[PDB]
Amino acid sequence: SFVEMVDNLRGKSGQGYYVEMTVGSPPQTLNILVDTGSSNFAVGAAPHPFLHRYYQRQLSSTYRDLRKGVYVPYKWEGELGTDLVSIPHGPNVTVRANIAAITESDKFFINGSNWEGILGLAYAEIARPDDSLEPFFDSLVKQTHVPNLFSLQLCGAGFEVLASVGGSMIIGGIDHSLYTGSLWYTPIRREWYYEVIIVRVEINGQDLKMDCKEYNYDKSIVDSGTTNLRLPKKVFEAAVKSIKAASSTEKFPDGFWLGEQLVCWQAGTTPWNIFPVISLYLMGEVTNQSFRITILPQQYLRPVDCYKFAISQSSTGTVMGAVIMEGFYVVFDRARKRIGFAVSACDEFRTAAVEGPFVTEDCGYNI
Ligand SMILES: COc1ccc([C@]2(c3cccc(-c4cccnc4)c3)N=C(N)N(C)C2=O)cc1C
């Protein structure tokens, strides 16, 4: 049942959400980043200064060598093999999955994140070294009776060390206790990343009035493995302009808007009401319909009372990252090629919202 998967996610603000997994026999316990923005099960498999433990293939009786390497510059590299994998607070199953045993890496692992690997939940098209390497979830679905869908409730922190965050990854279904109101769905435009289409953007109800192709230039994706809302240059600039104006009563250093520095108010004085809400309208399942997800400053200002601006520029399209997902229960409905959003169960004047339908075309940035 899904209840045993509730709160199966932990993390530190800004360092991703991880789920406990085991690999090999006997089970080796590891914390693994839940990442909808990639498609490899890649796990630290050799000593590293940021790793307090790692996957030891030699300790595993069930390890099988694929005698093939993988090199991922962007870096990390490893050796492909398969082994038995389980998620202790997930489905009660064990699957033989591809594992990229990371033997060397540079600026991949995060100091103090408390995770030792990544669970790439996106599609084979973007698996490394190529689409022949079946992703974990594909293996899980093919080998078990787990429904071809998962959902994420990322809860963030809320009110010396980075704030601890929590959440739930529900594998194989939708846990109604994790959300309120209606689930609205936007199509997965193509199965590689979880690519979606944004058709309109508003800041405090004010339309940015851009050609919608701009919102999806050159793609828009939903990525738990990204902290911020990342926006294409033109959209980021229009958004920041609008947010600045909305919060004009209080002026901040441009270093804050650039996501560099933190703004501080002493405990409990943060003027949330000065910052605007942001509404992303996503293409509906029905051609000329859309719906909006509305996020509060409590989502896009992330605690480090000090905060960093969690909206940042992208040259690879829109990325609806953790701070966006944190307002919502997000359903990755792979079976029906669609992604659902609803208000998550996790101030007194505003609330994150999911609302539709709203009236409209050709917003996709073809490829
Ligand atoms: C197959 O190779 C992969 C796999 C995953 C990733 C990353 C990744 C890698 C390491 C750490 C994080 C990370 C850091 C902080 C917060 N939250 C995720 C993300 N996951 C995504 N979504 N992103 C955009 C990435 O950079 C990168 C590469 C190159």
Side-chain angles (χ1 to χ4, degrees), residues 2-158 161-360 362-366:
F2 305 143
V3 284
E4 307 194 86
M5 305 187 210
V6 175
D7 206 33
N8 66 352
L9 268 27
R10 275 291 176 280
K12 284 296 203 185
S13 175
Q15 293 182 337
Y17 290 80
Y18 57 82
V19 61
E20 183 175 304
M21 302 181 70
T22 68
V23 179
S25 316
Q28 301 177 40
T29 302
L30 299 166
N31 290 332
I32 301 298
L33 175 84
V34 175
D35 187 7
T36 63
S38 70
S39 308
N40 284 80
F41 185 40
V43 179
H48 186 274
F50 300 158
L51 299 179
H52 290 160
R53 64 193 174 181
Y54 58 90
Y55 174 46
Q56 299 184 46
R57 291 162 289 169
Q58 73 270 15
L59 285 184
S60 175
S61 58
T62 45
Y63 171 72
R64 291 178 200 166
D65 197 353
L66 286 170
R67 282 109 46 77
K68 181 185 308 186
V70 56
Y71 181 56
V72 183
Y74 59 86
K75 69 180 176 56
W76 69 268
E77 68 188 67
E79 307 181 342
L80 297 180
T82 66
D83 208 339
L84 304 185
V85 178
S86 305
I87 305 170
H89 307 276
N92 178 33
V93 296
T94 294
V95 297
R96 175 160 293 272
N98 292 313
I99 300 174
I102 305 174
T103 44
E104 168 61 337
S105 67
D106 175 21
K107 289 183 279 187
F108 180 69
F109 299 114
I110 297 198
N111 186 30
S113 69
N114 204 33
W115 54 259
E116 292 100 23
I118 298 185
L119 179 61
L121 296 163
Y123 300 94
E125 178 181 325
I126 63 169
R128 303 306 193 90
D130 56 65
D131 63 7
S132 73
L133 188 70
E134 191 176 74
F136 173 85
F137 205 86
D138 287 276
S139 295
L140 174 69
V141 170
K142 286 178 177 177
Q143 293 172 34
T144 72
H145 290 100
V146 172
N148 190 19
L149 168 158
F150 65 92
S151 54
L152 299 178
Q153 185 201 47
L154 308 186
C155 295
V161 301
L162 280 171
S164 72
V165 297
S168 310
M169 176 178 55
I170 308 305
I171 285 172
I174 296 172
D175 183 339
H176 292 252
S177 72
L178 302 182
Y179 76 97
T180 60
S182 292
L183 269 166
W184 276 89
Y185 290 96
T186 194
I188 293 173
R189 183 166 183 252
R190 181 154 67 88
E191 298 162 309
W192 57 321
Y193 295 91
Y194 290 101
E195 176 183 12
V196 298
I197 295 289
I198 295 162
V199 301
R200 172 199 271 261
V201 174
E202 286 172 354
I203 313 304
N204 263 358
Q206 165 72 304
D207 180 6
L208 290 187
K209 289 174 198 65
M210 299 182 61
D211 187 318
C212 53
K213 287 194 180 66
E214 301 288 356
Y215 302 133
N216 311 292
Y217 164 69
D218 68 316
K219 66 179 187 289
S220 292
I221 77 174
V222 187
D223 185 5
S224 63
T226 292
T227 297
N228 291 357
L229 169 63
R230 310 190 60 232
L231 303 169
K233 184 186 288 75
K234 187 171 174 49
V235 184
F236 174 76
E237 293 173 5
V240 165
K241 184 185 196 83
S242 186
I243 303 172
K244 286 187 181 181
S247 62
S248 60
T249 84
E250 202 144 326
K251 262 152 255 285
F252 310 94
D254 40 316
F256 156 79
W257 301 107
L258 290 166
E260 310 209 59
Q261 301 151 15
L262 46 75
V263 56
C264 290
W265 301 263
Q266 250 294 62
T269 56
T270 303
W272 301 113
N273 308 338
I274 297 188
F275 296 94
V277 301
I278 298 176
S279 289
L280 304 183
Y281 292 67
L282 296 167
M283 178 187 293
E285 296 180 275
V286 178
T287 294
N288 46 357
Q289 296 182 13
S290 60
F291 68 93
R292 68 189 177 200
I293 62 172
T294 300
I295 74 161
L296 310 184
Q298 283 88 340
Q299 295 170 242
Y300 66 76
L301 306 181
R302 73 161 186 99
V304 301
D305 292 338
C306 297
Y307 310 94
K308 296 193 171 187
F309 191 51
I311 303 176
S312 63
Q313 184 172 142
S314 179
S315 306
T316 59
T318 296
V319 183
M320 299 167 59
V323 298
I324 294 292
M325 299 178 66
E326 283 178 4
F328 315 103
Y329 188 41
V330 186
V331 178
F332 294 76
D333 185 349
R334 294 157 59 98
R336 296 176 66 162
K337 296 192 57 175
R338 67 184 184 170
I339 299 177
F341 290 84
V343 179
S344 172
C346 75
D347 46 53
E348 273 289 315
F349 279 127
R350 317 144 108 189
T351 56
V354 179
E355 294 167 331
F358 294 98
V359 292
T360 48
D362 199 35
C363 296
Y365 201 85
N366 284 0

